[PDB]
Amino acid sequence: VPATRILLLVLAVIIYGTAGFHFIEGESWTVSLYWTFVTIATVGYGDYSPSTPLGMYFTVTLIVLGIGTFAVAVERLLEFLISRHVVICGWSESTLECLRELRGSEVFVLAEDENVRKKVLRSGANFVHGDPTRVSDLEKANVRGARAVIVDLESDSETIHCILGIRKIDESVRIIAEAERYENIEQLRMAGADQVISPFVISGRLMSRSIDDGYEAMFVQDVLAEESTRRMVEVPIPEGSKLEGVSVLDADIHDVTGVIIIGVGRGDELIIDPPRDYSFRAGDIILGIGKPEEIERLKNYISA
Amino acid sequence: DLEKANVRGARAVIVDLESDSETIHCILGIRKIDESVRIIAEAERYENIEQLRMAGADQVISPFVISGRLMSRSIDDGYEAMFVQDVLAEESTRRMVEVPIPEGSKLEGVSVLDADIHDVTGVIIIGVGRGDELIIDPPRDYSFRAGDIILGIGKPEEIERLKNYISA
Amino acid sequence: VPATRILLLVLAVIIYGTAGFHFIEGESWTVSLYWTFVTIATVGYGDYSPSTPLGMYFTVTLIVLGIGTFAVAVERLLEFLISRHVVICGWSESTLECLRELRGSEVFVLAEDENVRKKVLRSGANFVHGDPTRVSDLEKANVRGARAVIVDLESDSETIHCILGIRKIDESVRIIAEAERYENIEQLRMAGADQVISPFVISGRLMSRSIDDGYEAMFVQDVLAEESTRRMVEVPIPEGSKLEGVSVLDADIHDVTGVIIIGVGRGDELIIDPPRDYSFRAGDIILGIGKPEEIERLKNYISA
Amino acid sequence: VPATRILLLVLAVIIYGTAGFHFIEGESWTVSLYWTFVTIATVGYGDYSPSTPLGMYFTVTLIVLGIGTFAVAVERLLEFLISRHVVICGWSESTLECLRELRGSEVFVLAEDENVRKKVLRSGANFVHGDPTRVSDLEKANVRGARAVIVDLESDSETIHCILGIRKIDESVRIIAEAERYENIEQLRMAGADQVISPFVISGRLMSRSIDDGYEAMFVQDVLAEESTRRMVEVPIPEGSKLEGVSVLDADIHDVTGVIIIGVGRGDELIIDPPRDYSFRAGDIILGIGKPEEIERLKNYISA
Amino acid sequence: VPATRILLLVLAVIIYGTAGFHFIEGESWTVSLYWTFVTIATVGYGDYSPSTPLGMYFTVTLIVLGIGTFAVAVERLLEFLISRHVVICGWSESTLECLRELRGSEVFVLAEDENVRKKVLRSGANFVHGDPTRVSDLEKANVRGARAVIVDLESDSETIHCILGIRKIDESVRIIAEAERYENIEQLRMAGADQVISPFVISGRLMSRSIDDGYEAMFVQDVLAEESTRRMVEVPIPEGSKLEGVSVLDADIHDVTGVIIIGVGRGDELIIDPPRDYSFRAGDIILGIGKPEEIERLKNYISA
């Protein structure tokens, strides 16, 4: 029942009780109003009470009509008196291990199951119930002001139908999708995902190199772990550095610092093992592997 | 039904079944038949890696951990997922390879600093594998051994210049 | 618990308390009745109270037996104190977009599934749980008083069965049905339906006419949307108009008003592009397209 | 919370309040007990109240510890305060029409669905939730002291598994089963059903006689209806009748009464169209068809 | 609403009421506090009440602001006031008849389904919802303290996975497992199970031995039922017995006691029908069949 209607009903009871007590028992309007509240709240001090048979009958009627009405009114009154985030669409094992790396940031999880609510709240992420393919249930998860959206749904048709729903809300957020089949890598880039991570093509191409020597699958599963002794970090070249225009052979990063320069990224292209005559600029993101004792040595060497 | 598929005469068994409990049970069935064959498993959950490796699998590739680590690292910049998914594809410009150190090579006892493999050849030495361990970014005082495996990234004509530089 | 049983239980408590207080404490029947209400409502003025050990014990028994009973009774009492309609048989994707245009009126959605109770109540419709093929469940949904009944069920066998069930309840109501196959258009219409709307024959012909140029499909889906500029409206010719007896060539409605006379309908037929010799009569309905400023210029044109 | 634990908790509050008021305020044990009930029920007559600071503090503690406890206790108490039969195992359309002719008797219905509870209580039969194939859930429906048990389950395997569960409880009740296939008529008689009613063999043998003339299927569906003019009733021959030893030709029932003697049943065998030299006895049940004006004429002719 | 916030809200009401009554009506701080509790709890003794118009208005405000707040507070308070064990992994038909002989002890049934919560709680066991293959859900069920763990899961692949998960939590606990296929008896036993019980190999051999005469299957299913006359019991040989060093031929246990010595077991092996030269030692366990009057005649026989 709308709160305002309950308000009118309790006011009507108050008028009924106050006028009745005033006319039947002859007490002042103020005393009668006070008696009405004391009675319908069931306080019943007994400083005022009916002394006539008509007043007794009237009081029983007020008790029956008023106590329930007042109770509902007080409970309704109770109610009125009393960088950015990342959004994860869907819940699977690939997003469970993504949630371990994101304990410092605040994470919303948009999934349509109800049984998964105990797994999300244990990991430290707010759960938003809803269907991620719907634009109305994507706006509940604050897709519009997010840092990145991570889409991992059950199939590749729903992952595409969710990427196109996010691009309808805003065309500036970063979508990171996951492909289940190899053939749908190019459909998930046309829909609008910025980075497509196909895990069964990485896994299937590590189970074919591990037949003779398993060193390719031992390197990949180790440099991604933050508990390892070496880490793969991206070091950006700041504006006004000492290396703008300097080639890779003239820089000699591995001799002076101790990191291994396995690639240089400019914009959204990556050149693994860049050639000797590659000229640096300001804005190129250096992808390297080194100890943490060597990483701040690299930032102090390229600093302004 | 394993001995139908010639597990005794095989050189590698690749176990990838519908759940993680069936992958341990199939690994336990292979080790009863041939105790020295090379099993390459696939873990679904992260906590089952030490059980698949205790039950007998030599190499355990867990795809939902490599994908979970590459998702959370691609929020700011995705150059670490563009590195992993490009050195593995055999249609790419540069290949990640393994070369073995032959017996009687030119680099017996030679350290990695005075070898200067990136300057001489052009290949990127990201690790030297000895036996059943891999040392990513080995230090400057690391001395070689005849029988090592050098893991590297380089252009396909820079790899033939690496094998002729480590030749006997 | 049925409300009437709760009524009897509270009356029994009232008799018990009143008789007990009267006999044990010696107060009048009226005072005893009043005391019983004051006590079981938990008001407790204290103008009357037991003064004997037996009365004290009795009062504790009345408190235990009566307070809960009275509480349940007042809450049950609360519930009873606190053009025509349209009936929609079946819930689907055709009757969902029909319900958005029928806002403001009373709509009763008769559906077999209980899962659909949340979507019906969200869109502003009263849900009536039942099977729409049962004659005893159509009468529950108040079909006989309605102004139109909209039938859209799972198959065309259940749509004829729901149409035949309405034709014996009320043989005058307006039934709108939805055909799924083209063979059943003349079968649903003979069994009683006043308007048969087949969505797969409209969309089957709009897909074979959009191959060359899709202007046939843009005209149909824009004159029905009630958020565009032009609106396909229909105005009736009243008795004693200025056009009761003129031909279409001499009336010349498009120049003097600005609407487009796509068709006129007399009775239960429609004449699209009426010829110049067509004499306008009284009671005719002019189907037209125009801006809503041009519709008011046509409505005053056809007046007395 | 188990009801008995709530009982202990409220008793503990009562002891606490009574002892406290007695010792702190010096009232008798009886007055103190009464005051405790009046207070924790929130009645608060004020005939007794604390007059010392310690008593005031104590009373606030009793209010906080006792009012909620008493409220939960009264609501739990609410719950506890607030020939023979026939039992029907399973709910289908054949038992729905059986329930229409059993409105004078009391009927239990043992079905495992919960959605069917609204259909059973409308028809005037008590619903017992449970699986009818279990002996523990058959004893809840009072199979042991029933007049007849009527088994109509989804298949013929469960109908057999339910007949053998009833015969484990008692081997004297009358089981009336229904066969779904013709081949399982002899299995349902070996399990223990006294009468097997196979409806699809009656229906399949009436749809093959109704091709030429539909008079066989018009006779069967009419004499079973109690709204018909003629009815098929079984008239037993009492002990000490005027017809013992009399043949059918010497009796001439159709000449003197007007009923049609279509069979005579002795025990559990029926002889349709009995021969001329069939000698009557006492105990033979006469199966006849006649008007109700002719039936009491037949009982007055065979009477003692 | 968090319980602590409700606490603050009710404290604020208490301060408001107490200060108001003290200043407006002039009663002491203690009386004012008491009056506030009596009023917001709706007790209303009436020993204290406002006697001024301002006090009456104030009291109505306290009634409206305080009664609901106090009610919510007491209900929240309600919530805060109100050998070793055996773990059973999985719920099936083997662990249901195991649970009936484990009455009296603590049993924790770790099961994935939530449907089985009613059957576990009915039979006298604590239900622990979890997946029994997860090491984090075995430790939740308190496996490390237990005296035995009984594993009976859906397949033999999940039974080895649950056995391997216990062997790293506790490498000393007693695991009893159930094999489904005959090939996995030596596979479950090597992975850690202390006793492998295969029900389809016992029942496979009792069905091929009941063709000629079924006395082999009547011996097995009668010496295990704990309601028959004879009971297969096992008694241990204590230190300093009268038989520590005698052969079986000279001990002659069957004549002097009345039990049948079907086998004796030393350590982790069993010798069925031990020969006459078998020298009894200390610590041996004598597996025997006999009436419970004969078992006490054997237990005193093997004493000091």
UniProtKB/Swiss-Prot annotation, chains A, C, D, E:
SUPFAM superfamilies listed in its UniProt record: NAD(P)-binding Rossmann-fold domains (SSF51735), TrkA C-terminal domain-like (SSF116726), Voltage-gated potassium channels (SSF81324)
UniProt KW Membrane keyword: yes
Boundaries of every RCK C-terminal domain copy: 220-304
Spans through the membrane: 4-24, 53-78
Effect seen on changing D152N: At high calcium concentration, mean open time is short and mean closed time is long compared with wild-type
Subcellular location: Cell membrane
Domain of life (superkingdom): Archaea
Binding positions for Ca(2+) per the UniProt entry: D152, E178, E180
Keywords for this protein: Calcium, Cell membrane, Ion channel, Ion transport, Membrane, Metal-binding, Potassium, Potassium transport, Transmembrane, Transmembrane helix, Transport
One of the record's GO cellular component terms: plasma membrane
Residue spans, topological domain Extracellular: 25-31, 48-52
GO terms assigned for molecular function: identical protein binding; metal ion binding; monoatomic cation transmembrane transporter activity
GO BP terms: potassium ion transport
Oligomeric form and interacting partners: Homotetramer.
Function recorded in the entry: Calcium-gated potassium channel.
Record note on domains: The channel is composed of 4 repeated units, each containing a transmembrane pore part and a gating ring part. The gating ring is composed of eight identical RCK (Regulators of K conductance) domains, in an alternating arrangement of one domain from each of the four subunits and four from the intracellular solution. Two protein interfaces between dimers of RCK domains from the pore-forming subunit and from the intracellular solution hold the ring together. One is called the fixed interface and the other the flexible interface. The flexible interface forms a cleft where calcium binds.
Miscellaneous comment in the UniProt entry for this protein: It is not known whether calcium is the physiological ligand. Inhibited by charybdotoxin (CTX), a protein from scorpion venom.
UniProt protein name: Calcium-gated potassium channel MthK
Organism for this UniProt entry: Methanothermobacter thermautotrophicus (strain ATCC 29096 / DSM 1053 / JCM 10044 / NBRC 100330 / Delta H) (Methanobacterium thermoautotrophicum)
Gene: mthK
